[PDB]
Amino acid sequence: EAEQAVLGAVFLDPAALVPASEILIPEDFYRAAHQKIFHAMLRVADRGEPVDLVTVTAELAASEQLEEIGGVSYLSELADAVPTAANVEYYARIVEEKSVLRRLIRTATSIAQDGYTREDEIDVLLDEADRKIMEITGIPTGFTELDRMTSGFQRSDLIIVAARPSVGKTAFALNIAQNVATKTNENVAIFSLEMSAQQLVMRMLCAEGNINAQNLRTGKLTPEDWGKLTMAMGSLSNAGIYIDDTPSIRVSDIRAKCRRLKQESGLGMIVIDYLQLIQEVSEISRSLKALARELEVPVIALSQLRPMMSDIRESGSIEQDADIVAFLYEIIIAKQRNGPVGTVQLAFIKEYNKFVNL
Amino acid sequence: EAEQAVLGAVFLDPAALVPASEILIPEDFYRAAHQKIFHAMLRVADRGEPVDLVTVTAELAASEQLEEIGGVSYLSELADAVPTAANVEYYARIVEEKSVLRRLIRTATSIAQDGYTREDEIDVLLDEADRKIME
Amino acid sequence: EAEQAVLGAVFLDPAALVPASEILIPEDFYRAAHQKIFHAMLRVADRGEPVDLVTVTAELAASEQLEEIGGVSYLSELADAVPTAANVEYYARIVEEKSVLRRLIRTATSIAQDGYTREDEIDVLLDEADRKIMEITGIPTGFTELDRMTSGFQRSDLIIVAARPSVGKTAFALNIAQNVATKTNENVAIFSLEMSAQQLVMRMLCAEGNINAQNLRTGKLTPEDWGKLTMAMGSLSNAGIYIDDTPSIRVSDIRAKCRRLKQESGLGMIVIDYLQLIQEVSEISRSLKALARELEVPVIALSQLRPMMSDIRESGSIEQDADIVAFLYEIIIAKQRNGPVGTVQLAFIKEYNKFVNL
Amino acid sequence: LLPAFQNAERLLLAHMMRSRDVALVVQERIGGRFNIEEHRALAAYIYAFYEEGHEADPGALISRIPGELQPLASELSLLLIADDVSEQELEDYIRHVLNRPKWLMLKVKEQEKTEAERRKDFLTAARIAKEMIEMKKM
């Protein structure tokens, strides 16, 4: 009995027939009202024409279901009984499932009794009683040209830019974003999810001062690179960079540290790294959909399985929890609902860690 | 009380399922409904989608836990229950204890009614507290 | 009458113990006595030896059931009275209908009651509901010696063309996909599994119109990509090239995309992507064949992984039902029963990735 | 069986039974303007304590205020909250009480609206919907 909730919303929009008349038909309605209602709810579109209960109050009183629906009481009490206007589809589905019930009854019930009727024919009775069932906007990047051919980076986005084990998803977040927190003032709450921050603070500074390739892990630096490290030391600890690294948990480490700081710093981005060993995937992936809804700002979520949508389409929501899913092969595009389909190229080096421009 | 005015925000937001399964899961609900309300609250917005009362009335009516839970006679009583949908936190950090009341009561009522066992192997009941009372 | 006399005739022959039990296995009777004779009529002659009341009214007496079935009261008669044992079928062909029900009863309710005692499974009431009820011609390939050394394709064939990756894994599901669609007027089915849905279009706009080398991946395109494709952009979703948008689609997830797309649209062929994505592996193989066969139109099923081969005949039978089995690394075919199995001649231009053939 | 708003009006007769500089702004905000028939005089006994200056507490106030207003204001102190209050919980009850009246504005005029139902009017009686549906859209 979703029907009750299924019919009374073509008033709230009111063009809540834009998908509702792009989906089902009046038959699904059991009661002689709802059918001949939706039947005369499907004569508008001839022009057309458009949408109003009055265009139906001159329609169900014209073909007299005026005395054959539920009376005046039952007409307006549809506008009065449906709240969540953004459903429709949806929604109208459960009725087709109440009609999936109907898709079986007067099909099987026919056949079940056919051992007392078509007795007789059988091979005829077979292949028929079977063939029945045969149906800029635009929060920054640093290389300004990258908040453009896609257009940000904006409020409420699960911006996923993924790659294989240590290719792009590893340090990609240490590139684009260090121009949203260090360059403009839209601060962060970060999580290192391929290492501790002690190793995730040792990967981004490589970009500044042409440093970390001699290296720092084994030794130190050469004379002129200290006078180039002192020109790269004060844009991390000083900066509004506040990462978190906490071990095997579900998801609560974010929100246990990302609720108090809603009022303090400002929150312009929320940061996320790798996926497949933080202890399936969607109860951790939807934990970021209604988060950018509550905190209200662009967010980065780098997952793992090519990456195409298909190969991360079984190891993550990704297509759904995020319309936007860029990649790291180049930053391969797939599904965008915010800007034009212009593709781009910036060359990657693989040592000093820099995606230097074309 | 700490439960008898909870679910409203999940309609008022309605995508307030994230601060729910935040510090919590679908089990922290004794009252026979709230649990499989929340289990019917997860896999629904596990699509999808996000959230609205109706989409909740779906999988409950599906698992016919609307013949088994009761019906719509609560939907209007819980849509109309919350006088401000900013408590939320809260209230999931004040209603914790309410079901946390019995995290070490299950693991203690055991050993008490289980003096009637290790007698036998005696000693060993040390390390059940180490990995059920302790945590 | 049809069941009552159904023991007496083989009491009389008695080497007519075979022709009926062929058509009827031991689980097709009813009355809790005649089967205790029927199954017993099978559980006697195992030497040797063979079958008569002597040895029949003996093993029932051995398994002590002769005072549970009747004793020699209803036993003297059936042997004595039945006039002829020449029909013999019969019986296993006229009382077979009660078994046809005992085969087509428990399934329907496992669908119907799945909507009451279950509900409580979602798609299982949709699909395990659909489980136990059973219980050159020429189609333009578009090349030269792949069209000349293959024959067809004819209707109903289940093909399997595999290779070692990048070379011939996925560089073909676009080739005949624009050589039946952009060849003859029909609405075919072109899938995408390994690769994401429409990222495959930013791969076939690299083959049709040939735009990928200027680069299609650098910003925009050189003054050499323009007067090239719009005189034909009104010929891409107008000429049968449709694409699928769904992740973990098993075998029971796809037939419909050819069940309602051949009845109402067109569908002259079903181009698909590799098995390892569309998710032990022989009954499923007797469902892609039993799909290609159940539609009368050829089907592609690309696979993945001294002198020897067999290493695909090994991984679960496979090589017989999917009759034609090809092998690339290589452009030589390995198995097909249309006639000859000629060495294919094709190309791979990297840039256009196109097939200029000999 | 207490409804939604009845407690948002109580988001005052407890937030000013325990904090009165979280009550001076109510004078500015909810005059009022109050909803319930006995909940106006309660406010009328709240702001008048702010002038004399004595020991303000949960239960010291609720005796000023003789009888009836105690198996009511005492039951307004058998509650389950605290004194950590937000700026967007202060900007929340702004609508709540004073606007529950506007939920009424789809009842007493419906008596008229539904009496156009009895005369079979659907020409103009099917317009007040816009002066209802798209009246709640503010």
Side-chain angles (χ1 to χ4, degrees), chain B residues 3 5 11-12 15-16 22 31 33 37 42 45 55 58 71 86 90 95-96 100 102 106 109 115 118 129-130 133-134:
Chain B
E3 293 175 22
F11 327 134
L12 207 147
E22 177 204 345
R31 256 290 180 177
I37 281 176
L42 281 192
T55 199
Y90 181 83
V95 196
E96 196 191 45
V100 152
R102 299 154 273 250
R106 158 147 183 160
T109 308
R118 291 230 172 282
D130 292 334
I133 282 277
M134 263 205 77

Side-chain angles (χ1 to χ4, degrees), chain B residues 45 49 55 66 69 71 97 131-132:
Chain B
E49 28 182 72
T55 199
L66 279 188
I69 280 173
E97 304 171 359
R131 257 198 168 251
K132 255 193 171 69

Side-chain angles (χ1 to χ4, degrees), chain B residues 119-132:
Chain B
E119 289 175 63
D120 289 23
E121 280 107 357
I122 10 273
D123 163 55
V124 210
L125 273 169
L126 290 177
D127 320 306
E128 73 98 276
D130 292 334
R131 257 198 168 251
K132 255 193 171 69

Side-chain angles (χ1 to χ4, degrees), chain A residues 2-112:
Chain A
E3 300 180 59
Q4 284 196 54
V6 165
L7 269 189
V10 211
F11 323 117
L12 330 167
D13 215 351
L17 210 73
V18 174
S21 69
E22 278 178 31
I23 297 159
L24 265 179
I25 41 167
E27 261 115 286
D28 299 286
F29 308 116
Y30 143 70
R31 295 150 206 186
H34 311 252
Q35 178 227 333
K36 258 90 188 297
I37 286 172
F38 196 43
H39 203 259
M41 282 170 79
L42 297 171
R43 216 181 195 105
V44 154
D46 312 344
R47 318 85 176 156
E49 74 188 14
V51 199
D52 47 300
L53 163 140
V54 206
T55 203
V56 213
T57 49
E59 208 72 30
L60 311 177
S63 66
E64 82 154 42
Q65 30 193 306
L66 161 144
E67 211 166 353
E68 181 256 309
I69 277 163
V72 237
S73 284
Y74 270 72
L75 316 180
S76 301
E77 280 154 37
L78 273 180
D80 298 37
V82 181
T84 160
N87 301 351
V88 180
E89 305 133 47
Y90 181 95
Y91 196 90
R93 294 190 192 107
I94 319 147
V95 183
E96 195 257 37
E97 278 69 291
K98 289 273 168 168
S99 162
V100 152
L101 295 169
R102 292 179 281 278
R103 285 213 271 184
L104 174 70
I105 308 156
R106 277 207 158 193
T107 88
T109 321
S110 144
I111 330 159

